[PDB]
Design a protein around this ligand. Sequence first.
Ligand SMILES: [Mn+2]
Ligand SMILES: [Mn+2]
Ligand SMILES: [Mn+2]
Ligand SMILES: [Mn+2]
Lengths: 4, 628, 545
Amino acid sequence: XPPA
Amino acid sequence: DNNPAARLEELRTIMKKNKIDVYILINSDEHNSEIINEKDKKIVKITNYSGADGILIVTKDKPILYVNALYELQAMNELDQNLFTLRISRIDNRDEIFETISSLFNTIAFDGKNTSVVFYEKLRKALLNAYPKKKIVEKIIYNNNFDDVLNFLVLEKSLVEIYPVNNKTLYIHDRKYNGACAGEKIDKLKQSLMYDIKNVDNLLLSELDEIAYLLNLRGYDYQYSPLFYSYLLFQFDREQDFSKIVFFTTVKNLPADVKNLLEINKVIVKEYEEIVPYLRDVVIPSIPKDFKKYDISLSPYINLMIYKLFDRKNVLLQNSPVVKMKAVKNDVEIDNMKQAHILDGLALLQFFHWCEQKRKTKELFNETEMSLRHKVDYFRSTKKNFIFPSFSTISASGPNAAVIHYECTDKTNATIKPAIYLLDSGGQYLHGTTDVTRTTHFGEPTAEEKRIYTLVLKGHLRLRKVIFASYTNSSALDFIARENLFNNFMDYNHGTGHGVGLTLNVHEGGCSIGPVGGAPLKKNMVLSNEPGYYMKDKFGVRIENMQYVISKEITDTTEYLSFDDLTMYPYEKKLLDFSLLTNQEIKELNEYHTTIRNTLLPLVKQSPQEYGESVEKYLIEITEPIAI
Amino acid sequence: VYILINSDEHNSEIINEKDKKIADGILIVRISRIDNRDEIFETIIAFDGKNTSVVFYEKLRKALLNAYPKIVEKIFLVLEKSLVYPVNNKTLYIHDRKYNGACAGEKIDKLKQSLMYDIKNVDNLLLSELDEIAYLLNLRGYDYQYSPLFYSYLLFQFDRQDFSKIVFFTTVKNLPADVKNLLEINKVIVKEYEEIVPYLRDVVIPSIDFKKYDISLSPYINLMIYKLFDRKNVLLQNSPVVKMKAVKNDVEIDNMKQAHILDGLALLQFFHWCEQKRKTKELFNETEMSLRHKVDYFRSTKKNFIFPSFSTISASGPNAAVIHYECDKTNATIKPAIYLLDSGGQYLHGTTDVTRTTHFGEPTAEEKRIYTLVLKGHLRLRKVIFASYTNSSALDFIARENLFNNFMDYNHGTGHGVGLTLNVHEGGCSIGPVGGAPLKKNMVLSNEPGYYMKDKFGVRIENMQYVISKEITDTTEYLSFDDLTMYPYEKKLLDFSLLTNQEIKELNEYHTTIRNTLLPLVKQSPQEYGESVEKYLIEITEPIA
Ligand SMILES: [Mn+2]
Ligand SMILES: [Mn+2]
Ligand SMILES: [Mn+2]
Ligand SMILES: [Mn+2]
């Protein structure tokens, strides 16, 4: 998943 | 029910017997790992909050737990708010916790193993300007002897002690996968110390992916990354090579062929827990007393314990040269990444083929998120050179797809519905690490759903093929992935892309594509491309590929770059809004889908046992060219 | 090894005749690109203490220390008297509040607060940037040709508590009588300009883990003032005034709009003149110089005009490929070909900067294509909607992308900040490939993509615009721009194969807006603007089918  | 009020009221006594007023508990380990093992999860045993990001201030008054914004809806559902004060951290409020703990107490404690120097210093420098009158005395507490004591206390061992042990052995990552010998990499690191870093002769590698990458070794200490607990210490001798190399790790997990091969650099091998007394006793006393010379170079997020052994004036916090080293893949690595993604595409194909068949039977609607998650994980596991999943699979139906990091559990499981379905999944292979998201629909898509998908897809297709001058900052690339959402006053609360390791961590630094911080990109960097959009209580969409930086064109003046695909799996035609799609996008979709068919179809046909003709018909179906 | 730079004691980009010993250049006793930037320090002792900035000098000595490892430096030699002119006797004047929206005391108060909260480690601050001083004191001057600024220094000393002393160094013979009031009115002490080095040396400096600095200096400050201190005690940073005037207040934006309306009127008269003469073949006996004098003339007749904000670029044909082109022995005849006009002015209302490219002949398909590719990024940047966290370098990217798709690029930045009756290039914000930061509401920026071909031609299309708040949702603030510049684009140069319907709609919207704004003013003064002018304005603002 997303780096955020 | 493993009661916290019990464990908290218990803790408050152990703080008391130590004269310890305020205690900060954080979820992390001494390697700054994104995913921590159980032995390092202290916060959950005390709060029943199992979320990964969180910080716990434990005082005489009501304890406060900070968590990230993405974990909030889980913390309300988990954390009892009568016992503990709940609070959210956002990009807005970030330093609030520093302000907070400044607002309370003359004795404070930290887990030396579980705290970054970054957190510590920002706090300590919060209390410098908070209470200029107070003097801060920092102390490392060894073997629970507090009898030698603003007191800042770095704790050698946690006040919360705990889990399974890993006995599986380290293995060599064969050159055929990594493209370069450990010796070559260590020779490159050597060159860095001569030219680049001339103000330090001592370097400690604390990042596990850096140590694995450099030594071409992998291990079993982590569930989702094939890494192993270690430190690698380098001591440079200017007059122009390495004086010593000290490898701290779990020796019982060190195989025999690796040890003899560790006589190749004549590496000294120590036990893992000896890092502190070795630095404290052997290293530090040996270092002799316009241009400043530093005693040691530590990674920015190095644990507090290792840091406090030195005088802060003599430590240099910066990235290892390994960071830039791993961010640019060599061609063998790229080629291997392609093979891993090819294997992954085959696995996704089986997964969606199976879904589609059960969609028809309608048996798909007795399935759950957990069931679907085990299936894709299974299909990957039947693949050559597969190690294990590269992170916990996000399998989310309908409204749960609006939760970015959503995790089904045996407890949290939902029935698959004829609605939006989001699957974010990836694998570890000897060939590399993969990360891919696809969003599909098992029902009749609504107009809003198609439109949201397509607006996400437009950003995603743009970033696949974008042409950019080599100087272009990666934050520009992040912007074009969002443009089409921006035009609609829509956004997503995460970054667009991250670097990705070769059989290391699914999130690797050294490059990224995001709104804050950015730099130019280099050829053969590998990055994710993953715009999304999330509607609470309704649904969400994310579409993610991995791709690598290629040279597109070189003129007399300028070098232009673009990307090339790693990920091979098609997009969802049922979700397409053709009123939003230019013909250049449709052609790009078609060109991608045909490349997928050319690649995967011959692999399918030759294992009719494993795949069969229903699968290739399915493959041919989802790759059929769209009409202009 | 002597190092001569083109800069003055104040880090002016456009330097007076007193300062030119060799615009952009460095003499050492080869081009500099975005990759090649540090080449010169790798390439490379005495310096002009007046002309040399501590950024260059510290970067040099540091670079030198990397190799060859111990240097000795005496005021490395720093020359007070430089090795290797007209004077300005004209008076300074107050910039009225109706234009700038904030009293000089109200600014100083804001500045005083920066020292209580933002800067806690130093009590002394020296302002060397002429526009910062002019902005802070709401005063303007004649010391420079294209910017209404004056040679000065301004030193603040803080009591930690309040400001203990404010001393203003300047040319006192240019300080008027009503102004000497405003100086004692803020209780300022007024000293002369050459007193800077003596006052710091023989007065201020005798005073004063967790560290306290002696003085805060702007990064590009000259060495003569710098070397008056030991490096350890000198904190190099932007002053608080850099982010104060980068954000215009609303009265400032209102005045900026009015400045651009007057400017739209001057361009309208200028190009109406060109066009009448095009019809008669008369234009082709004119020259780059006469067209230059003509547009400067038409501004000079606008209300509250001061002088041109930079040297007008009037460029025909192949000359349009020279980005910085400056008209006597360089002067060329006007041709039936590409013509590029880059001009602007200083008004009491604000500073303008505009570029339009047109064609006095019949455009080739190449010229139209190049023009339209440039225009497309220009138009994109005009109306772009972006989350308020967006780095400005991203805005720079989208002004390039259409050019990128064809493997073309321009060798300059897309935009810079603009001051209010100040420098036409202002720091505090920009739109560029290298440096970038999030933009804020009421920042004023140029938007000026281009493309240039040696010996053939060039195109640049430039507007000024300012940042607005477009939408605020639960999570996010979306920003966009609104126009300052009001002048049409060139319909003759449009390639309609490259233009989307959204671009046409926006063109029409912009052109009808220009007509709605300029036309009633034109009709108010028939003797300044003929019926020919009205008809011409109407024709260039007509919707594209
Ligand atoms: Mn993912
Ligand atoms: Mn990802
Ligand atoms: Mn201009
Ligand atoms: Mn300009």
